Design a protein around this ligand. Structure first.
Ligand SMILES: *[C@@H]1O[C@H](CO)[C@@H](O[C@@H]2O[C@H](CO)[C@@H](O)[C@H](O)[C@H]2NC(C)=O)[C@H](O)[C@H]1NC(C)=O
Ligand SMILES: *[C@@H]1O[C@H](CO)[C@@H](O)[C@H](O)[C@H]1NC(C)=O
Ligand SMILES: *[C@@H]1O[C@H](CO)[C@@H](O)[C@H](O)[C@H]1NC(C)=O
Lengths: 49, 111
């Protein structure tokens, strides 16, 4: 997740917590406040795709 | 919490770094300060004066133009014409909204 899109040829590295509503999660990963990174889970079991 | 850009100039060379520094409120260097975290780019190369610069931030590239001439005016900018030749073009890929200049002080007061 992110606030706005990316410009061409830029990169954004930031360990922040992105909240969805009015509640300001200051360093909290509680409700409506999540981690922006997510792994893939590449297994040799998975079909092409 | 985000990246930054740092171009300083000591007595011989120029060093440019795009690390993730945490900056103090009054940065300078005495007649010194730079952090180093997750540093993704580095580049080192080689009132009678006036030195002019133009900075642009276009498509993941940083553009710098430069020109210097000798002046003898009292205190203004001169009323002539001179054009600014290109200097360097750096692929930094960041977001820039503010900037701040550095000075070479004499009395170190990390305020
Ligand atoms: C580049 O950085 C600026 C400054 O952080 C971003 O501008 C912010 O954008 C959000 C969402 O639109 C606003 O809530 C903030 O108020 C803005 N800050 C300022 C100081 O104006 C800008 O979005 C960043 N560029 C990109 C492409 O994300
Ligand atoms: C400028 O600083 C660099 C380190 O940032 C250093 O290696 C270099 O020798 C300095 N240039 C001088 C002292 O002329
Ligand atoms: C900087 O690098 C270290 C080493 O992997 C990493 O733990 C840290 O999260 C990095 N900082 C970022 C990506 O902001």
């Amino acid at each position: 997740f992110r606030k706005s899109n990316l410009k061409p040829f830029e990169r954004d590295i930031s360990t922040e917590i992105y909240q969805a509503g009015s509640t300001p999660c200051n360093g909290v990963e509680g409700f409506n406040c999540y981690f922006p990174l997510q792994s893939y889970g590449f297994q040799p079991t998975n079909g092409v795709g | 919490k985000t990246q930054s850009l740092l171009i300083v100039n000591n007595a011989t060379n120029v060093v440019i770094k795009v690390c993730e520094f945490q900056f103090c409120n009054d940065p300078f260097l005495g007649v010194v300060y730079s952090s180093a975290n997750n540093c993704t780019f580095e580049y080192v190369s080689q009132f009678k004066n006036l030195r002019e610069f133009v900075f642009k931030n276009i498509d993941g590239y940083f553009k710098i133009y430069s020109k210097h001439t000798p002046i003898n005016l009292v205190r203004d900018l001169p009323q002539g014409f001179s054009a600014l030749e290109p200097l360097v073009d750096l692929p930094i890929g960041i977001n820039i909204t503010r900037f701040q200049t550095l000075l070479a002080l004499h009395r170190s007061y990390l305020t």
